[PDB]
């Protein structure tokens, strides 16, 4: 598994691959790992698939529960804290193989400069969190290759489409170097999922656009 | 004596509700419209319980706010345990009826509240919105068209009966609701809608310039 | 004075029963028929307790809904612990008797409810249906032919005695039940059958166009 | 006042048992015979406690069914803890007396029941069957010949006293008991025997054509 | 220990051997392993002798308690479920060494056909139960030898007497191959116990009939 | 043990073998592993037989309990979630040795397209679930052979008859390559149990049709 | 009579408030100003709840000191669990409403306290200060301009109403508050500000020479 | 009636305190001086709470001894949890106010006590001694100069007001206190000092020959 | 990581590096390890970054909670006791690897002499604390090198500026000898964070001054 997130002028993008393996056997080919947690936050969990899904569900329920109870949504720091507390509570089961590594992407609607309102938050195993200023982050087994690809392609990022292209290319490199991350399946028509967050909110990227980007990348590297 | 005690509790609760602002919840083409005369902009008698389930209340604020928080907790737990589409307005109305009956019989002071639980159909579905009225003693009723709570609900009920239009537009429904409620202005008025045309969450607050334009 | 206390507690529960809609359960060739005058389509006074066990109630809705849920829990727990065939209507009737007696004696306010538990034979077996009536104080009675609960039950009972006939068809028995209730239409009628012809689950709701075509 | 409260509680229990059907337990040549007037075939006032220990009761059905279940639980637990032959009618009578005394002085309303516990000798042994009568307040009495419970007990007690025959056969004993209760056909009559000639379990229900032929 | 059970037209028969051994040493020579639980079911428990006796007593108490409380006995499925619950509640003791394998023979009086109303139920260590359709079953250490003997001898089972003979012969074979099973002791005059359940109920076979059958088998094998 | 499930236009079909083994010893020959959970969902549990039966009974009880309480059946997602919660709760026992892997086949009456209402949900060891889009899924020890047989045979599935034939053939292949899976017993006349779910509901496939299909498959491969 | 119990409970609490010193909280250009009549420099009626949330109370000291401690605990827990900026004055006012309602109904003696929770906008942000008044029975109100406490509040509130100036300076607001309170020197006066211009903690006490120069 | 109950409870507590010996705690140049009229040399009405905090009480001995032990436990726990210099007289006085409020409202009989908590400055610091008077109902007050407790306190208070002298010597303060407390001998007097000149523990008893010389 | 603290005439200064590692891989480049706990105390926690942030937040919350409840801030010994209690209560969790070692710098406002009001408190593993009288202290993986550098450089400390320069030089030496401590990174312009506490309170040092000092030190050693 590999989930990449990167900031671009005016927002943030978050892409993830689709493969799920148990050992070496490919058990899933169309998993979705990027969830729109709320209107301005996407979350993506790497690690055990079951724990990833249940953590996404718990986090979305918690955020909406607070918003309904108190009439106002949580601040971004509050969301980060709730996610970090969930990770810290999971630590014990994470030692037992039920690991979950979240990556949080958001748009700070209360930020002074909306062109720099995108936020990427990474979490370590102990439950600590860091707001990335380098502009990109990755989680999962192929996260190192994806990060080292984004380090060289982040200069290209200038808008939403350029950021999305770099995100798919980072995922392509991760899948190229790692057998637990799935590359673009031109045979089955399965491509990485992506979410784009800007001032207007968090929207799922249509599959056709990612298909075009992936085919362009494959042609480029042929 | 239990009969005298029960009657006295009923009088206490009824008098408490009678000296309160009025709330109207009426069904229209887009879903359900809540209109409550509320001078305060922070203390709100109308709220969201779940995706397609909304809440209105009349009476003492802290009591029905406690009830509202309990209902939100119940709905979130129920939706997590099974699924979001398994949470209905009928289950929330039943829980409220049970809770209010227990409070009325057992607590030191009965709750001086009246509740409306409203549900609209899911996105891309046809279904008449359902309105459930729960009273102070847990009595639960299904009102097909509209609910009036708090204050002297009888002139408002008669006016709404005379002036209710099925499948009215949002602006028309606001006109009729505000007119029956007057029997006020944009300020001192809290307006919300369960909008059936929303993808996931139906609840939406209509206040400010939008409300003035609509009113 | 405990005598006066119990007398007025019983008076309160009985008076609460008196001002409630009536329910009739009767035995016919196909099993058991429940007919109630219930205006709402959402608050059901007749329910399935178990495969061949059905539930009817009259009185305050939240109280007998609590009892209905308790009985369903008991039946499912018992069927899982021993076997599905080991659950009879008599055990559920006895549990309701215990619960209602304890509630009447100890609870702050007695339940103004009256229950009927009906049981039919299993698939491919012959047995006359069993009707048990349980009152607010926990008094339990066996009725061979029919049970009438809620409201002024004397006229309905008399009409049933003057118009009951064992081994009647579903249509005819429904006609007698509706006529006895009158002493209504497809609306304001909730009708269900414990149908002994079904393989496992005997409960079947008759609503809408099918009810009219059967009425 | 304590004396007044206890006396009114006692009168409540006494008047409760007064408006109840009567049960007789009398010792005949083969063991003990229980005869009760009971229209219901499912609600049974006469039951088995343990292998040679039988139970009869008069009063509110739910209360003595709860007591009967408590006695059965106690007898089974005690027979498992030590042995089957270590369970005797006297211990069951004593636990019933303790339970009824605590209920009388502590519960919100006292149990309106009168119980009888009968024991016969084990197989191959000669011993007079033991009859224990226990009242609502926990008073326990040893009766050598017969026990009469529920309803008006004076006339039937006098009839039995004048007509009771020692070491009578089952037919003559049943005739005497039925005539005493008359002062009633196969229907509305529940009859059982603790039969001392059985190897392990003495209790046996005389019902159907057997009772009709024997009566 | 070996307890065999087999169906014959019109009922079931359950037979059991008499030896109890602690290790290699013969401690008991007349242990009774088949119990008439109620009027129509018999149960035989292999494994630890203490657990066997305790479980038989507990099961009989539970069935009698239900019949006395509810005024009607359990169905056969209810009895099977209660026995299986008891077995599932003994896994910790089984790992501790206080183990028990029950075998249940019964006569379903509610069964539509009287001539097929016999039932044999076998339980595994995990608590699962199985109603046998092959007609015979065995539990204990010599259960394999007894089952393979019954596989060849079951064709000549036609009534109660031939079924009893086949059960005694299966016990003989199990004793012949397993030292923990005791055979007919012609010196002390101790023979296997047996219970026959038919439409009239469950009755213990008199020791004389089993003695005659065992003597005939021994004379045949010489 | 092997349970296969596959989608065909207008419904789903779930079939299972009949063998139960305790190590290398064949204990059961007629075990039923496919249960009609309710009128539109069938479930089949592989692993320990005791745990499989217990899970099937408990899950059916839970579903019917909810339907009786609320007056309306659970949605399909709710049923999946309840099954997943049971699987996740069984994790301690599964580590201990009481493993149960379920497979769920259903008909979504609320689906937009009745022809695509067939649903197959596989559950992983950790409780996570996945709605299969391949159209076929197998659980058990022979599940890999069955899945790789259906991968080639699935193009022939056009209706209920062809789907049932393909499911039976997949079970045959699983039994061919796996010794813990029971093949068609032409001697004892024991064949896999199948359940077919369509708009009218879920119904057990009669033994005779499965026998005819198995005989045809055997004769084709002779 | 529950009505009489509630009304004399109300009389007790209101009379306790009546014989108490007065407090004033008013919104001004720099935030919120609290002025209380307090002869003791040790016992404080004005306090800080959270970074931008301040607390004022009138009545029996120990009761509202317990309330203030509970509110500080709630605010600290809420800030640590989510974030410092997720704590508002509305949540604290709602908590006080629930607490005071429960105390008034359930406890032996109600609390003779009257509370004001004030919130100012965060640093660098513009927002009118919020003032919430909570009464002894749990009632909560949003006062847009000022809150008055303790003693006879009618003359003080009338003087404040006649003389209040929105967006006044600190000197002007302090003079206005003291003049309305008279209807007082550095002694017998407790003065504090929720100062909207402070970076994080807005609460600041104005005593001694600074208060002398300001007054 | 809660009002009647609280008023008669207050009457009971005041009557209990009135029939008791009197205590005076007055500030002088060296710190605080406690003087009590107490014949018993074994039971002490004045004790040390902490290094610079002293306790005096009037009323029923067992009740205020329980309070003294509780306050000592609280002070020691607080000093160990944070530091010895974090314990102040005001915190102890607040704890006593909470304890006495809860006792007055909830316990069957209110404590007939009147407490004074005195605090002197730490070694090397010049701070005015602070005295807190806590009444039976939890009311807490700052006394700047002296506290008079128990008995008929009006004459003693008047004498102290007329004859007080700030920064008086130990001998002058002791003589003035004894003179006011009469309005007798050296025996039947308990005299103690919170002496601000001590390095750590200020409390110091003055009995016997030293007390004779000092007076 | 390394946090140094040193007293200068008239106050205390406390500096910390910016690097966080996971093994030998660098994961954070601008971690902030020095926190202004209150107006006159700063704390700096070495060890696991998650636990460091959690400890700092909890300690600040506890101090502010006491100040609000009792109306008077804790004495310095009270603050030391609260921090020591936290460290003692984290011993069991530090035995699993969630270790945290704090260093406390403060300005005692109750001290008679303003020129000697700076305080440095070091806490050992088991919760013991010592008030350093030598005038400097360090915690972290590079703590020994920083301490030995400060031992030689402490004679140059006379005011706040020279104290800050010596603290930055000690951090430079710690980073020079220890790879887990981040040095002055001139490429990205990330420099150690510093806090200076004097009679006026505790104030963060602007990044420009620390950048100037780091550049001067780098030039001197070039």
Automatic annotation (TrEMBL), chains A, E, F, I:
<keyword id="KW-0888">Threonine protease</keyword>
<comment type="similarity">
    <text>Belongs to the peptidase T1B family.</text>
</comment>
<dbReference type="GO" id="GO:0019774">
    <property type="term" value="C:proteasome core complex, beta-subunit complex"/>
</dbReference>
<dbReference type="GO" id="GO:0005737">
    <property type="term" value="C:cytoplasm"/>
</dbReference>
<keyword id="KW-0865">Zymogen</keyword>
<keyword id="KW-0645">Protease</keyword>
<keyword id="KW-0378">Hydrolase</keyword>
<dbReference type="GO" id="GO:0010498">
    <property type="term" value="P:proteasomal protein catabolic process"/>
</dbReference>
<keyword id="KW-0963">Cytoplasm</keyword>
<comment type="pathway">
    <text>Protein degradation; proteasomal Pup-dependent pathway.</text>
</comment>
<protein>
    <recommendedName>
        <fullName>Proteasome subunit beta</fullName>
        <ecNumber>3.4.25.1</ecNumber>
    </recommendedName>
</protein>
<dbReference type="GO" id="GO:0004298">
    <property type="term" value="F:threonine-type endopeptidase activity"/>
</dbReference>
<dbReference type="GO" id="GO:0019941">
    <property type="term" value="P:modification-dependent protein catabolic process"/>
</dbReference>
<comment type="function">
    <text>Component of the proteasome core, a large protease complex with broad specificity involved in protein degradation.</text>
</comment>
<feature type="active site" description="Nucleophile">
    <location>
        <position position="1"/>
    </location>
</feature>
<keyword id="KW-0647">Proteasome</keyword>
<keyword id="KW-0068">Autocatalytic cleavage</keyword>
<comment type="subunit">
    <text>The 20S proteasome core is composed of 14 alpha and 14 beta subunits that assemble into four stacked heptameric rings, resulting in a barrel-shaped structure. The two inner rings, each composed of seven catalytic beta subunits, are sandwiched by two outer rings, each composed of seven alpha subunits. The catalytic chamber with the active sites is on the inside of the barrel. Has a gated structure, the ends of the cylinder being occluded by the N-termini of the alpha-subunits. Is capped by the proteasome-associated ATPase, ARC.</text>
</comment>
